[PDB]
Amino acid sequence: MEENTRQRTENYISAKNQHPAWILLATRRAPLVLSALKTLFEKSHDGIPLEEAIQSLSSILIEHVSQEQYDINQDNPFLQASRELREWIKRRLIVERDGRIFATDALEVAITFVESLDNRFMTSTASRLSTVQREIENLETRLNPNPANRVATLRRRISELERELQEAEAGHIEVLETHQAVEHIRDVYNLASSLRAD
Amino acid sequence: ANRVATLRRRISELERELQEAEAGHIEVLETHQAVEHIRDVYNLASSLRADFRRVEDSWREADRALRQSIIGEQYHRGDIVERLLNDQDALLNTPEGRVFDSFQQQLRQSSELKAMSERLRVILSHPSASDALNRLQRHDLRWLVKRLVDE
Amino acid sequence: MEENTRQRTENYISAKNQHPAWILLATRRAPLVLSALKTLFEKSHDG
DNA sequence: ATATATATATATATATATATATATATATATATATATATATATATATATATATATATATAT
DNA sequence: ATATATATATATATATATATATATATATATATATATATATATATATATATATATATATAT
Numbered sequence: 001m002e003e004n005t006r007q008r009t010e011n012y013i014s015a016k017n018q019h020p021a022w023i024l025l026a027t028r029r030a031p032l033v034l035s036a037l038k039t040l041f042e043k044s045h046d047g048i049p050l051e052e053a054i055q056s057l058s059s060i061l062i063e064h065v066s067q068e069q070y071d072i073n074q075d076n077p078f079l080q081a082s083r084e085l086r087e088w089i090k091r092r093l094i095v096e097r098d099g100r101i102f103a104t105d106a107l108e109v110a111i112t113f114v115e116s117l118d119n120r121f122m123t124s125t126a127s128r129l130s131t132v133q134r135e136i137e138n139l140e141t142r143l144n145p146n147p148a149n150r151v152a153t154l155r156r157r158i159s160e161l162e163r164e165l166q167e168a169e170a171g172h173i174e175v176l177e178t179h180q181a182v183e184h185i186r187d188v189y190n191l192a193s194s195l196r197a198d
Numbered sequence: 199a200n201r202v203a204t205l206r207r208r209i210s211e212l213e214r215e216l217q218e219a220e221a222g223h224i225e226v227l228e229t230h231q232a233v234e235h236i237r238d239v240y241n242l243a244s245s246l247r248a249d250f251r252r253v254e255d256s257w258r259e260a261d262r263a264l265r266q267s268i269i270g271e272q273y274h275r276g277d278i279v280e281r282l283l284n285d286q287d288a289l290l291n292t293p294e295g296r297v298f299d300s301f302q303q304q305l306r307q308s309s310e311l312k313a314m315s316e317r318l319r320v321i322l323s324h325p326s327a328s329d330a331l332n333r334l335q336r337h338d339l340r341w342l343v344k345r346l347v348d349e
Numbered sequence: 350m351e352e353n354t355r356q357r358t359e360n361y362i363s364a365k366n367q368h369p370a371w372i373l374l375a376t377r378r379a380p381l382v383l384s385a386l387k388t389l390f391e392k393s394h395d396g
Numbered sequence: 397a398t399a400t401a402t403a404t405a406t407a408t409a410t411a412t413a414t415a416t417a418t419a420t421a422t423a424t425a426t427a428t429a430t431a432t433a434t435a436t437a438t439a440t441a442t443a444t445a446t447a448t449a450t451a452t453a454t455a456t
Numbered sequence: 457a458t459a460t461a462t463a464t465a466t467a468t469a470t471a472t473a474t475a476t477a478t479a480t481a482t483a484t485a486t487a488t489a490t491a492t493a494t495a496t497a498t499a500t501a502t503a504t505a506t507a508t509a510t511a512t513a514t515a516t
Binding site (some may be wrong): 032117118 | 354355357358360361362363364365368370371374375379380381383384385387388
Binding site (some may be wrong): 001122123124140142143144147150154157158161168169179183 | 213216224236242292296300301317333
């Protein structure tokens with residue numbers, strides 16, 4: 001709407017010039033950068049000792065010296081790991097506190113971007129639908145202030161559960177098939193794993 | 199027996215909830231809670247379309263491949279029919295295919311999708327919605343179910 | 350995943366050279382174009 | 397004896413000079429968008445010609 | 457007789473020129489990036505002057 005039309009463009013001109021997560025993706029070296037940093041943080045997100053990170057990064061740096069165009073240092077990869085952690089602090093990718101480095105939120109967004117990007121299989125998956133389903137049901141039922149309507153909700157849901165209880169009394173249980181189970185599991189991982197986000 | 203006990207505990211939960219509701223003790227999403235709750239539910243759906251994107255790309259690519267391969271004279275009629283059937287089965291069993299198939303299966307039980315759209319309308323009616331979502335988001339969510347069906 | 354521990358850099362090297370969106374985010378003019386395009390499509394729901 | 401009080405000693409902080417690590421100003425090269433140019437395609441108009449269908453003259 | 461054949465106009469197509477917009481490509485100027493020379497911060501040995509106490513004299 002016009003309310004934000006003219007304003008928004010400037011809102012984006014700003015982010016391009018200053019916001020880190022965007023700035024990184026503009027730099028030529030962005031691929032190696034983001035790959036390596038994902039590598040570093042993946043092992044655990046509780047926080048890494050600085051020089052432990054120096055060591056692991058230097059190890060990863062040598063792995064990719066074969067990427068010739070970026071001239072990854074050879075005579076002392078450990079020193080280069082240090083000179084590059086300096087950069088990822090100065091560029092606000094990793095604030096370090098308590099002596100252990102960490103990933104600025106800008107890095108979280110940038111990383112969750114590239115992952116979704118490539119054409120490997122998707123972030124969401126089938127269960128997502130049943131998820132929005134049940135949550136919408138619950139969200140409506142709660143949001144509804146009319147008490148008789150909550151009564152109707154409870155009556156219908158309890159009658160459903162009564163059907164299934166009677167069936168279970170007769171032993172008519174059913175379970176996900178590997179298809180469904182695997183799908184739901186990947187979904188649930190991708191779901192709770194967003195709580196960690198903010 | 200595990201499922202039996204699960205059902206027993208759930209029915210007891212809902213029994214207590216009904217007893218409270220009949221006593222007049224219903225509870226509403228406190229006005230601020232509702233806002234974030236809605237923002238959450240919106241964010242949840244905000245993936246489905248962006249992945250039907252890839253469902254389209256995959257089946258489009260499969261079609262392009264089957265065409266491009268049909269030029270091979272070497273292919274008997276029986277070869278091409280088999281290639282078709284196998285391409286479709288493969289594209290179906292892949293995750294995006296599983297998503298598409300799940301969606302389609304839902305369409306057999308249309309009542310669920312229709313009820314979902316109904317509840318979406320009811321939700322977007324509530325005043326809090328205006329705060330939780332600018333005009334555009336409310337528009338799109340109001341018309342989610344369609345924008346999947348069409349897709 | 351361990352294979353991906355090296356192959357991953359390959360994917361990202363790929364995206365930054367070919368994938369449209371990524372390439373878009375890079376060019377200098379990008380924000381203006383992206384903002385405007387959203388402005389257009391924003392109203393649209395059938396194209 | 398215990399307690400005050402002694403010169404010397406233990407241990408230290410500071411100072412000088414040395415080397416190495418880091419931060420920065422600057423240079424330079426490469427990557428990239430953008431202007432200029434030639435050839436192409438689109439569409440216009442202008443005009444000639446071909447086409448269908450009918451008006452019309454005609455055979456038997 | 458019924459129906460056949462020619463001339464006319466009309467409706468359409470084709471052809472040509474002018475112009476403009478497009479696309480493909482060259483050359484250019486600009487920006488990012490990495491590379492460099494310099495000055496400065498950390499760590500160290502030796503040496504000295506210092507505070508704390510031993511070691512110690514001396515005392516009640």
